[PDB]
A paper describes a structure:
As this residue is conserved between Orc1 and Sir3 (Top), we expressed the Orc1 BAH L79I mutant in insect cells for our studies. We report the crystal structure of the complex of the Orc1 BAH L79I mutant in complex with the nucleosome core particle determined at 3.3 Å resolution. The Orc1 BAH domain interacts with the H4 tail, the LRS (Loss of rDNA Silencing) domain composed of histones H3 and H4, with the region of H2B adjacent to the LRS surface as well as the H2A/H2B acidic patch. The acetylated N-terminus is visible in each of the ordered BAH domains and displays a large conformational change when compared with the unacetylated apo-Orc1 structure. The acetyl group projects into a hydrophobic pocket formed between strand B6 and the loop connecting strand B8 and helix A5, stabilizing the conformation of Loop 3. Particularly, the side chain of I79 makes VdW interactions with a hydrophobic cavity formed by side chains of H4 T71 as well as H2B T96. This residue, L79 in the wild-type protein, was mutated to isoleucine to increase the affinity of Orc1 to nucleosome. Specifically, Orc1 residues R29, R31 and R32 establish a network of salt bridges with acidic residues E56, E61, E64, D90, and E92 from H2A. The most striking feature of the Orc1-nucleosome structure is the absence of an ordered H4K16 side chain in the electron density map of all copies of Orc1 in the asymmetric unit. The first residue of histone H4 visible in the electron density is H18, which binds in the pocket on the surface of the Orc1 BAH domain.
In this context, Orc1 is of particular interest as it contains a bromo-adjacent homology (BAH) domain, a nucleosome interacting module, at its N-terminus. Genome-wide studies in Saccharomyces cerevisiae revealed that the Orc1 BAH domain contributes to ORC association with most yeast origins of replication and characterized a class of origins that require this domain for normal activity. For proper function, Orc1 as part of the ORC complex must bind at two dramatically different types of chromatin: closed and inaccessible regions within heterochromatin as well as open and accessible regions within euchromatin. We also show that this newly discovered role of Orc1-nucleosome interactions is distinct and independent from its known roles in silencing and replication. Together this study suggests a mechanism that allows Orc1 to bind nucleosomes across the genome irrespective of the acetylation status of histone H4 and reveals a process where direct interactions between Orc1 BAH domain and nucleosomes are critical.
Residue numbers in the entry:
A (entry chain F): 18 to 100
B (entry chain H), I (entry chain D): 32 to 124
C (entry chain L): 2 to 23, 28 to 33, 36 to 106, 115 to 213
D (entry chain E): 40 to 134
E (entry chain G): 12 to 118
F (entry chain A): 38 to 134
G (entry chain B): 18 to 101
H (entry chain C): 15 to 118
Write the structure that this text describes.
DNA sequence: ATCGGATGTATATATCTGACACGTGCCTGGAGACTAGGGAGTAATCCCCTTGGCGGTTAAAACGCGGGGGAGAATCCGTACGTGCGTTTAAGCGGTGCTAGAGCTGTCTACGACCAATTGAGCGGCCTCGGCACCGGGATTCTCGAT
DNA sequence: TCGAGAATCCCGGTGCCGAGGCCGCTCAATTGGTCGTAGACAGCTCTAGCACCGCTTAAACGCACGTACGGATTCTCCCCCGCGTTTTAACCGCCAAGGGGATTACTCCCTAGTCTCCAGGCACGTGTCAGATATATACATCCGAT
């Protein structure tokens, strides 16, 4: 029994979202932006991870490897290099 | 020469769903384009699946996983159902 | 079940509102369950079952939450929330939240009830070759009204909801949990039961 | 003390000249595992898998923030608002 | 003996032999299992039936006995999942859905 | 002298051209435009009627979608009038520029 | 000596762009919008027609068929139905 | 004497031929396709590596890290158009701040 | 087992264009992914070209047409040029 | 030329901007120009040069002005794009008329290289005239043979030599409207 | 504007360190030397469909003018967000320890490719009639200025 | 919020051409086998993913203060809409020429296939040098005092 992972979307801290926006060229950030970004990231990871787990299960494996994630990202038109 | 299409099959399915309802040639060609597009999508996804797993054959399992990859929401579910039924009938004969 | 013969002793039945089916097109929500044909044992959403946990060696009670159909590896997946046995709880947490480690173990093992389970927000896929029988879950009042006729293998009671680690107990109506599992989709029910204890 | 905005621009330049990941690794890994828990039980992840997931997510969010900043400036503003993100994701087709 | 088409064994209207041929000679893999054409034809028939049901409803709403492309566009864009599947797809002679923003309305 | 207020006939044209599927650009000017664009790639080309018809279908579809996005961008700036800045923004987010 | 085709981008008249915007749900149209739309349409058609003429040239043909336009559009992620 | 040596290239014509034959692209594969394909791949690798080496020397570094690749690709118009829907890991972004957000 | 890549060839090319320049392992993997991505794009486009014209062979002509479809601008020029040089040498040796 | 055996007598010469070049790597801000040299006598054909071709479709000969030089198309190894001239019988038999109509020329119809001058140079050099080599161009018109607009042909030569083809073509199109 | 203090930064130089470039054994994939069956080059012919023309209609486009209202500028107020500073938290690291499961191997069998005989399913062509386009006439639903 | 005017809508009548059903009639789907190998599968190796412990300290969180930015508000200029009048070229019907798209047939060139042979490239190992890190020192920039 592992400790229940609950509301880990809150782990995407405010300074982290602020850093991401600073990289994107954002000078001033509103308050609702943080929860909006948490939701957006949650949907994104839901789709990508669902596809990656489909690839993992089709290979009759229990471990999600890097190739599954690369294949999912490519399948969603967000091709990723380096892995 | 002969160039085939899905016209008779789409018409059969239409008469099943709507008995006394017709379809124009433009809409018929649209339906044929749709069937061919979905075919290309599912067959390509299954091809890449079998190529990922070092497999040389396209089994109905690859088609099922491709359907679950492409079709969204309930459309997937029902589709898989409609697939499995067909298979379980064909494998029975 | 993984393959078809893994459910050969079972049968899948689907009902929409009340009537049964032997549909194709979508409509403006269908429910699924599985029946053991040797005695007509129906397992649906919200039902409580007992499984042979061959890892602990004893057994473990679960509450069916979702019934995934036609996955890419299993023909039928049985998702269920887990229960907590009386020996899977933390004695220190119960002695500090309600009121030397061996002393609290003694207090708990002597004073607690052998058939008192506790819900968890964690779920585990179940297989039918480990299923025994269907469990009957009581609440706080029905367990005290029914004291004489209590089958030690079929009767259990649940009052609190806590995390799998065995702390931060929160009581809730278990009959209302049975209703809420069948009423709403699992994506929202699991989330609700998860944030009930944080 | 500097005016409100100077430290922000310095942050912009710092985080544009560098390429390190801006999210902590362990909370993100926990998030990935929580999300995957609703798909399959008892899944395992290579380090490289979660790392590729984080790189992809960070790239996605930073590009979305560039488009959101453009959405905010188009309305004669210098502050990003949720309607900016929503409009950017609508134009992109994610909505 | 006597012949029997695989579409009859599967209980489908779409051609199982033609799907099998298109899969084997379509340069998709080295070989094609005998279960892939049945499954694929079934999925194609189901999606065709969905499109045709929604489009026939759209045609009956205009009191027309024949499906035109406009009905197909209405059927696809009014269904959430079908519109999500046919996102990057243009239906010729289909038009757009009757939609006007809130601010553009008269006051 | 009956006279409609500014915006009424605009909304009426919106409703009139949203309930129909006919091509809104003149056919022969479009065909000549396609030929003028193609003459820079290969000299003395011929076109199937279906070719230029499919070109016009796709062109009008793309323009209607871009106009929807551009109107959303104009409304986002608390305006009801589409402007070249809105088209530029729309094509910048789509990745076309 | 075929007929010289010049200034055919002007054939996309102002009322034509107006109708296209009205179908897109546009209430008010600025003056400079029409020229911008002409330019954007020219870019789009240039890309599509260049790819379609590439397909036609590959087939060693002199007549641009509908399948060439369909293939070019589908290559550009603009899948079109109703022509094959 | 390998075919890559006969054609004056560095990429493996034999391996490209193997991948084209067993990649399920067509029934038959001509013996001139792998040569042409490997030559094109060599040109593209050369372009990216030369621009990345330029950007790396401008960063006073003799080893090419992913940041140099991202700079070279995003600064070159046609390369960026080639890798539009492509994400380079560990590459960051180009330094660009809108003119509206500059201090007064 | 052996799992090959494009490392040695990219290293040769790098030493040719920049003799005194190394590359990191992450950038090496990025270059390998880029090579494989461009390869599969060009090969898919050539496959579609052959399939459209009812042909069964991926000749160099299909590769050149796929390059002119996929590579943009001056890249399309030089690449084609390079593709023609190699062939010219290959048919000579 | 279609095949490689269709330009055996010729050769493709590449130049940076004006000096000779013989290389691969796409250099920043350096557009490479191309022309072709016949080795039989070293005759150079590039952008701007006007040539005379055998037009077997009309029975006569036609004069063109080389505008663009496509190398390695997906059907021809070299495509020769050129503006067409209108001869005297399509409106002095050695006065040509420029048009924006383009044409694709094949090298096996080449004859000589036309020497095109304006009106002043035509009056200055009257006693020493060659009928099959020297022509004069004063106007530019439509392919139909009307709407004449006078222009210095030397300046047009320079402008075709300088600016890119896709721009000069549109420029020449709107010169007559 | 111009000048001092304070802050963070660009910059010079030096120091570890672990990641990278090269040496080495080897084995599995590429080359050389034939052969064969079909795909593709190439010429000949049918015929479809693309180009072009002409006349008359008129519906759409172009032009112009009054004017309503929408975009844009300038102003004011409140408050939400930026910036430091101190406190709280857990991310990161640096090891150990284990074992679940990824990965490789060696059969052996069932399933799919391949080819020959047979036919009826799905193709192309041929009418032909009715669903629908076109047009008009009267009713309904707005819109907009005011008793 | 009540009538006059103007768009649209709905229904009746007429005609038309395209959707549908049906007729032969090729050819591809089926049947019926044989044979080859792809993968199902149990087993062994051993890679690395999980779990954990404590320490350090960087990161996150909360809070005080202030300002500058968003949003509402009023005013104004001109620009775009509604509508009338004039001009134009799109459009439809019908006709003719032939260019080039298909189809067919013949030939032969080419690429798959195999068998053998060998070396190119990879897994493994090792030393060592370019970059991440650090401390300190000018230096640009900000910001308020004057």
């Amino acid at each position: 029994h592992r400790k229940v992972l609950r509301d880990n979307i809150q782990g995407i801290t405010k300074p982290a979202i602020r850093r991401l926006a600073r990289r994107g060229g954002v000078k001033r950030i509103s308050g609702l932006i943080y929860e909006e970004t948490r939701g957006v990231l949650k949907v994104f990871l839901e789709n990508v991870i669902r596809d990656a787990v489909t690839y993992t299960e089709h290979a009759k494996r229990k471990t999600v490897t890097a190739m599954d994630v690369v294949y999912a990202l490519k399948r969603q038109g967000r091709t990723l290099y380096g892995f | 020469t002969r160039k085939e299409s899905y016209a008779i099959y789409v018409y059969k399915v239409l008469k099943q769903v709507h008995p006394d309802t017709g379809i124009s040639s433009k809409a018929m060609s649209i339906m044929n384009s749709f069937v061919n597009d979905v075919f290309e999508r599912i067959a390509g996804e299954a091809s890449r699946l079998a190529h990922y797993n070092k497999r040389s054959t396209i089994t109905s399992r690859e088609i099922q996983t491709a359907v679950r990859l492409l079709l969204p929401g309930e459309l997937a579910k029902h589709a898989v159902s409609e697939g499995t039924k067909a298979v379980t009938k064909y494998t029975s004969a | 079940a993984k393959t078809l013969k893994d459910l050969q002793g079972w049968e899948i039945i689907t009902t929409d509102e009340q009537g049964n089916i032997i549909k194709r097109l979508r409509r403006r929500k269908t429910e699924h369950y599985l029946k053991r044909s040797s005695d007509g044992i129906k397992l649906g959403r919200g039902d409580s079952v007992v499984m042979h946990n061959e890892a602990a060696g004893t057994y473990s009670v679960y509450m069916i939450q979702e019934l995934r159909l036609n996955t890419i590896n299993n023909v039928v997946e049985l998702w269920a929330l887990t229960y907590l046995r009386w020996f899977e709880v933390n004695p220190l947490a119960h002695y500090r939240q309600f009121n030397p480690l061996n002393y609290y173990n003694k207090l708990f093992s002597e004073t607690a009830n052998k058939n008192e389970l506790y819900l968890t927000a964690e779920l585990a896929e179940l297989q039918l070759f480990n299923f025994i029988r269907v469990a009957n879950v009581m609440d706080g009042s029905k367990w005290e009204v029914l004291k004489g006729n209590v089958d030690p293998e079929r009767d259990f009671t649940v009052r609190y909801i806590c995390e799998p680690t065995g702390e931060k107990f929160v009581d809730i109506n278990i009959e209302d949990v049975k209703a809420y599992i069948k009423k709403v989709e699992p994506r929202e029910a699991q989330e609700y039961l998860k944030d009930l204890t944080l | 003390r500097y005016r409100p905005g100077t430290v922000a621009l310095r942050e912009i330049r710092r985080y544009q000249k560098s390429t390190e990941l801006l999210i902590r690794k362990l909370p993100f890994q926990r998030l990935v595992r929580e999300i995957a828990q609703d798909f399959k039980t008892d899944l395992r992840f290579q380090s490289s898998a979660v790392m590729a997931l984080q790189e992809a997510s960070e790239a996605y969010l930073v590009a979305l923030f560039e488009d959101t900043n453009l959405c905010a400036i188009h309305a004669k503003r210098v502050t990003i608002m949720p309607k900016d993100i929503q409009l950017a994701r609508r134009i992109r087709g994610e909505r | 003996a006597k012949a029997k088409t695989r579409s009859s064994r599967a209980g489908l209207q779409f051609p199982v032999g033609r799907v099998h041929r298109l899969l084997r000679k379509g340069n998709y893999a080295e070989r094609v299992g005998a279960g892939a054409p049945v499954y694929l034809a079934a999925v194609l028939e189901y999606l065709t039936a969905e499109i045709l049901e929604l489009a026939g409803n759209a045609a009956r709403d205009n009191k027309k006995t024949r499906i035109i492309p406009r009905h197909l566009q209405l059927a696809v864009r009014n269904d959430e999942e079908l519109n999500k599947l046919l996102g990057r797809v243009t239906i010729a002679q289909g038009g757009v859905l009757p939609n006007i923003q809130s601010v553009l309305l008269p006051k």
